[PDB]
Design a protein around this nucleic acid. Structure first.
Length: 71
RNA sequence: GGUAAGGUGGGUGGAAUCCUUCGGGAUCCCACCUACCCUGCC
């Protein structure tokens, strides 16, 4: 699969970044997680119900800002 | 007992960029399978 997230778009348009996962909360049926990034020296964040959703949110923010575009 | 929703681990497969002595190296994503955790309905 070529991908399903804004993560791969960013990582193909302009790679050269770092990511930092952050802790979780809630019960197993309402669980949440978060994922942050450092791109071009900027910083971004994005929580979600799972690890992929977190990175998709944070990477979409990192993309739109650093790329001066939108998803 | 059956039915449905979400999360995590493990295994396998698929996919992209960068570098390369073309043997390889680095970065990175997804799906499937299996097990586990947990909630809703009847």
């Amino acid at each position: 699969p070529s991908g399903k997230n804004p993560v791969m778009i960013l990582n193909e348009l302009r790679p050269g970044l770092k990511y930092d996962f952050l802790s979780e909360s809630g019960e197993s049926h309402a669980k949440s997680f978060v994922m942050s990034v450092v791109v071009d020296g900027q910083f971004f964040e994005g929580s979600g119900r799972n690890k992929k959703l977190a990175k998709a949110r944070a990477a979409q923010s990192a993309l739109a800002t650093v790329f001066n575009l939108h998803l």
